[model samples]
Each structure stands twice: as C-alpha cells, then as structure tokens.
Target: SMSRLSWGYREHNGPIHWKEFFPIADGDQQSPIEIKTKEVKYDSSLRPLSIKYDPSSAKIISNSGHSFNVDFDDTENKSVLRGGPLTGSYRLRQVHLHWGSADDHGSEHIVDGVSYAAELHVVHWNSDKYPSFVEAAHEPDGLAVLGVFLQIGEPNSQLQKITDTLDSIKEKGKQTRFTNFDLLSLLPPSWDYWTYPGSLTVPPLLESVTWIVLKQPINISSQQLAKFRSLLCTAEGEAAAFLVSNHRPPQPLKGRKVRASF
Candidate 1:
C-alpha cells in the first residue's frame, strides 16, 4: 500500500521513486545541494535581506503528514520579507522544519561536507506579481525560502513555545491555535547566506524557489529536538508511523551559481 502514497522519506516511495510520479524531481535546478564554501562566489551587488514579521500574523500549527508547518495569516502585508535578490514584496506564508530519523544529521544543506541536526524553512511568496502563492510558484521569480540550520548545543529558549506545542499535534491531521511567535528570534545572529536558484526539496519539486540558506546555524539541545520526534506521519486509528525524518537528500547543482552575501 506504500505505492498508493505519492511520495515520502521511505525507501519504497522516497526520492528514488519520486521521479516516477513527478518527473520534475529529476529537474536541473533541484535544491539542498552541497555548499562548497571554497567555490561559492561573493557578490557585492546582492541586496541586504529585509525581514518584517508581526507576531500576531501567526495562525495555527499543523502536521501536514510529512512535516510540521506553522501557518501564518498572509491576508495582509503585515508579515513580509523583501530585498535579498527579490523583486517585490514577498508575503510570509508558513514555517516548516526538516530533521533526520536519528538525531545527528538531517539538514537539507551540507556545508563543506558537514550536515547539521536539522533545517527550518520560512516560506514566502511574491504578492506584488501573483494573486496567490500557488500562482506564484509557477513563475521563475515566484517563491523565496529562507533556510536556517539547527546544530546541536545548549537548549534554545526561543524554541520552547514550539517544542511545547508538538504534543498537541502529535498526529498528522491534528492542529492547534499557535500564534504570537517572535519568528525573528529563531534565526541566528548573522544573516550571511548562500543564494541559488532551485526547486522545492520535496516532491512535486517545482524549480521556482530562490533558496537563501543561512551560513550560521542555531543551537538546539538533544532533549529539545526529541520533542519533534513525538510527531507521527499517520492520523489516529491508522497504522502508526513516526514522522522520523522528512529531509530530502542533496541534488545536482546543474551548473547553477551559488552567490554569497558576505
């Protein structure tokens, strides 16, 4: 019955089988590529990243089967991200995370052959040009995702609210009112990052994302990260399966240039 599912992190229906259903999974501009620091080019022309977020703009947190997405109310331009190789205002949509089944390494981006414990994605869509996020995803300049790596260290206080809420949304279909999140506090001190034109890391891997991966990784203790392991990929009463891991492996760079903001 695993074949009934479209895609997942399992060997049966994971990345290897994704191309069977979503041909673009083998696209040229795939994401989560290896970041060879020595080869990355630093460009002085790149604009500084501009991030503005309203704590009240946050809505609910839900487990979308494969991952946890903290949805934000994008009805207004209250929480938006601009600048940084972007043309117009990009509305913040949701925040999601990817981690491994084990606890050591599962981050999407690998820097100099080093993989972090996890990765967080702040998804945004160009509102000035597109009517909706779905519409924006079809264009080359449609989506912009900010990626922050999570490394192992002391527990992070800013992540407490999130780790506490993980229990309520243990099942795939479960959701709870989770708002007033100071999202900016979750990022690292430095904004230095690598930018590249790429596709969504997961299935239906559309090549519309402008990936902005932060160079600095935040800290999260092992105990704090264990809370995320409590989440399940299945709903209540179904065959229970832990959403152990949801990170996609690195794909080919395909001659794409990775620009750095140094």
Candidate 2:
C-alpha cells in the first residue's frame, strides 16, 4: 500500500537522494547547518524564551515509521513557547528524536563542526495567526522548533519515562497513551541558544522554521540511547528493520547569519 520510493534513511531513499522528490532539499534555507561559533553574532535584541508546558498537554506517543513522535494537545495553547525571537505564542505540537546507529554522532545540527550523540526536536507552530500546524507549515514565518543536543553520559531520569514506552511502540504505526511528562525538567539549565531561519529536516522540507538550537546538551547514558534504536521502522507484519539512524545530514548555510542570544 505504500510507495516504494518514498523517503527514508536507507541508501536508496536517504538524504543524498531526497532532492529528487523534495526539491526544497536543495533550497537555500535548509536546516541543520554547522554552527560556526566564530561566525555567529550575539544579538542582544533577542528576547528571553518563556515556555510553559503543562504535563497534561502531552497526550500520546507513536512511531511514525521515521521516528518516535510524542504528540501534545495543542488545541487550547496549554503548552506554548513565547519570546526568544518569536512575535507571538507558538503552540507545542509534538516532540521527536533523531539519532545514529552508534553513540558517536546522531544529531542533525552540527555545532562548530561537532555532532552530538542525538538531537531532540520540540515542534511548535504559530497559533496566533494560523488555525493549525498544517496550515502554518506552508507559510514563511509559521513554525519554531527548539533543538536540544543529547550527549552520552549518565542516564536522564526524565528520559526514562519515554524510553520505557519504546517497547509498546516498537513497530511503525504503534502508539500508546502517554501523559503527564515533565517536559520542562528535560531542558538544560541555561536557555542561551543560536537562532537561524531554516526548513524541516524531513520530507516536504518546508522553509518555515525559526530554529532555536540550545547551546547546552543534556545527558543520556549509552544504554538509554540504545533503547531508542530498538524501535522498528516497519510495521508488525513487515520485515523488521531497526530505526538505526533517522537524522538528516547538515545542509549548506547559504549566506544566512546564525545569531546567538548570550
């Protein structure tokens, strides 16, 4: 029932071959660029980020064949992100992870030519002007994604809740009721970050994201990260294929300025 040539991380459908189907992959504003610290400009004009995430807003966790997605209830703006290079409130939609086969490098956005073990993307859409996330994805100033790098270290207690659910959603399309997650506790102490204009790292690759990549990385033990790789990219009846890697490689900066809020 699915298209054979659809997007994926395999050599046949990976990042190198995405431009054939999604022309925007070759576009100037592509995401996950290498952040050169020396070239970054400190922008005092940027406002401090204000985030309020109600634990109850997290509704479910699922496997989208691409990655494990923890969805949120964004209907009433109970969990929203404000300030930090944003004009209005951006409602939280979902959260997902991108990682590699091993622990060495799995992050999408590279910092000063360095890659972390993994990356967490907390996706949000401009709710003030757009009716929904789908509509917002087509507009220029429609989405803001918070990027947090993950390093190999001690196990994160907050991440334990998520890791435990991997067994339930092992197959693609599988999902489970997941709520009351202490999402705030997962973030790093300092909110200092780098900001840039870019697109989504996946297919459709729309140029509508205002990326705010956190400078500090959170800890996740090697054993904990290995749990994420246990998930399958195929359905229950299909030939099993572990989601060994789901991260898109970094793209060209294309003259865009990376700003810092330090």
Candidate 3:
C-alpha cells in the first residue's frame, strides 16, 4: 500500500523552496522561532489559553515532508470554536512538528533562552467560509497556532503514537490508516502562553498569523526526538535524503507587541 505513494525530494524545486507553493511568499521565517522569554515582549493579551481537542476525528496525512501528520480535515463540519484572547473562530486544522538528529537538543522555539529537543505546532484556520489557506493568509487574523516545546526527559508517551507509524511514512507519500490517536495527551500540563502576530514561520512567509506559544515545555525522550530527524529529509537533490532542520530563526518583534498570560 505504501509503495504506490511518492515521498522524498522531486524535480521542479522541493520542500526547501516552500515559497514556490505560493508566489506571493517572501520566503519569510518558517517556524520553530528561537524563543527567548527575556527578549520577548510579555503583554497581557495572552490569557485563558485552551485548545479544543478532538482525537476522534483527527486524520493522519503525509505532507510533502517526510513525517506523518494529523490534520483536522473536518473542522468545518464540527462548527466549534471556543473564545478567549483568540478573537476569531479559528478552527483546528493541522498539527506538525520539527526536530534535529542528536539527543541533547534540536528544536527551534527557545524557552527562557534554552532550546528544546523538538517543537509541535497545531495550526488552525480562520474559517472554512474564507475559502483556501492562500486567501486566508491575507487576513490579519487568518491563522492561529499553538506551540509546545519538547525536551528530553522520560520515555515519550505522547510521541509513541506517531513513531509507531514512522515505518509507514518513511517511504514518502505512503500512508497507513490509524485510529485511537489521542492528540490532547501531547499538550503540556500548563496552559500558560505567549501571544503575538507573526509570519508563517515557513515559506510563503505570510505575516498574518496569531501565534500562541505555550509557557510550559513537555518531555520527549531523546530517542523520540531522533525519530523526527530519521524520518525527515532534505531537498538537496535526487540522491539526497530528507533533512530534519525545519526551524526558522526568530524574526524581529518588528515593534509588534508580544503578550504573555500572567
């Protein structure tokens, strides 16, 4: 079932050139932004952080990337968006991750100046009524993301559900059906967060996303973090294997206010 699917790099550009997917893209800062609490502005807008979790309906799909991801494909039909500091009714759409090869640390988002082993991103859309991700990108509050930094600790239970399917996705474009995947267990214990308006953190660099980065960090065993690297690839060439560096360097606050829930 997996062999029929295509994965890894191909001709006419590659994942590294994400902007090619959307011409308007400035090739802006892709995510895993280096989070330094000391340098970040902590405003009061960040508050009452909570994610509407529904593991029952999440669907795992293989993106152009090498890893397997679960996206909320039916978010529109559900018609549920809880309100808080989050102004718009943002629907849960997709969740993805980025990490490095070694065991010590390889994530993008910085915590109090320390980097984590990995970072998980839960991406949401403004609403299906708006059409596609491209059009939604133009809205000031088009998208919202929940970021959780992952550190090396005990064996990672949250990530096991994903790694278990690695062999299925390692072969590119290939997919295997799975169920009982509980995404809520992946979130950190604390609901504290930092809020700000930022770009896509990837290519197409639409500077129109509301970013909510978690104050607390979760633990993923060193082995689990390596799974992300091992399954990921680079776009160097046909002979090249998928690389694992999906982190973007943090952008200038650009005088934009960054808030934190105290």
Candidate 2 residue lDDT tens string, 69-146? 999998997899999999999999999999998899999999878899999999999999999999999987999999
Per-residue lDDT of 137-245 in model 3, one digit per residue for the tens? 7777778778888878998777888887776666445556666667777887777787766767655567777788887888888677666665535322344465455
Off by over 4 Å in 1: 2-5
Which scores higher on TM-score, 2 or 3? 2
Tens digits of lDDT, candidate 1, 1-262: 3343547877787777888878888889988899998999999988989999999989999988888889999889999999888888999999999998666788998888989999999999999999999998888899999999999999999889899899899998899999999998898998888999998988778899999998999998888887887788888998898888888889998899899999
TM-score against native, each model? 0.97, 0.98, 0.80
State, as a TM-score between 0 and 1, how close model 2 is to the true structure.
Answer: 0.98
Which ten residues in a row are the worst by lDDT in model 2?
1-10
Off by over 4 Å in 3: 1-32, 39-42, 75-81, 132-134, 232-240
TM-score of candidate 3 against the unseen true structure: 0.80
Candidate 3: C-alpha lDDT:
0.63
